[PDB]
Design a protein around this ligand. Structure first.
Ligand code: FF5
Ligand code: ZN
Length: 257
């Protein structure tokens, strides 16, 4: 039922999901001058060498690459986190044009897109349990700007034609998510939520300062996806981002000076 249109979009979500008006919703605007450098924050540990991708799916809101999360292979640790978080899936949010698409903003600047690498805390055993906990998930957010192509994204781009409409999926094995990461792991962090229903307040957000560059041709391929199922009117999957939400009583911390 929920979506990104006039009648079912973000301004409507609170009716089915009242937590939409909660105390720790995401995304937020990152005011770079107000974020406090925190010298106690550790370097982020991203260990993706043994990642096992499984499938790629058009779920009607994004496309989603799923990983085998049944063992500690691809894990996120350190940074602001306590313990070990397993990589579950990644997906993107993007715009109709290059000047919008990101969920987080940086001094009100919107990027063309935002990549979410979604991890869950192994101390809760499974993602369904983890989403019921305030420290259950860690999402690594990476901004996309348009310029030079990202070679490590091309394998993703080249299969989107096969999952054009809602409910389509395909085999997507041997994808290496290290190819999606920028040089620097400098980050901002804050406590927040899922940015799609059920908007659960279970996420430690880790947003990298350095965007990746993707080509116009790569992002155009995102914008050829459809929100609709094949038996419904064609509606391009664009502008699948939630706008910035009130920061309320939260502090954004920087890992860097
Ligand atoms: C062993 C095996 O074969 N495992 C394979 C996975 C099975 C479970 O699959 C899954 C896959 C996905 C989910 N839910 C989500 O990820 N919700 C979510 C919503 C919004 C955000 S964000 N980033 O704020 O926009 C992040 C996460 C649950 C179970
Ligand atoms: Zn997301």
């Amino acid at each position: 039922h929920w979506g990104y249109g006039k009648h079912n979009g973000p301004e409507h979500w609170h009716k089915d999901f009242p937590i939409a008006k909660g105390e720790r919703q995401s995304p937020v605007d990152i005011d770079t001058h107000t974020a406090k450098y925190d010298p106690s924050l550790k370097p982020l540990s991203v260990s993706y060498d043994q990642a096992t991708s499984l499938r790629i799916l058009n779920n009607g809101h994004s496309f989603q690459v799923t990983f085998d999360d049944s063992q500690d292979k691809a894990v996120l640790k350190g940074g602001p986190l306590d313990g070990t978080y397993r990589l579950l899936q990644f997906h993107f949010h993007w715009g109709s044009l290059d000047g919008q698409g990101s969920e987080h903003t940086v001094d009100k600047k919107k990027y063309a897109a935002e990549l979410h690498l979604v991890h869950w805390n192994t101390k809760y055993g499974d993602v369904g349990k983890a989403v019921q906990q305030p420290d259950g998930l860690a999402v690594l957010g990476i901004f996309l700007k348009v310029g030079s192509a990202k070679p490590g994204l091309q394998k993703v781009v080249d299969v989107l034609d096969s999952i054009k409409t809602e409910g389509k999926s395909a085999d997507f094995t041997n994808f290496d998510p290290r190819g999606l990461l920028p040089e620097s792991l400098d980050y901002w962090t804050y406590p927040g939520s899922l940015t799609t229903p059920p908007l659960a307040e279970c996420v430690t957000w880790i947003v990298l300062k350095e965007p990746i560059s993707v080509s116009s041709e790569q992002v155009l391929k995102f914008r050829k996806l459809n929100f609709n199922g094949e038996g419904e009117p064609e509606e391009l999957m664009v502008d699948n981002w939630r706008p910035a939400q009130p920061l309320k009583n939260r502090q954004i911390k920087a890992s860097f000076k």
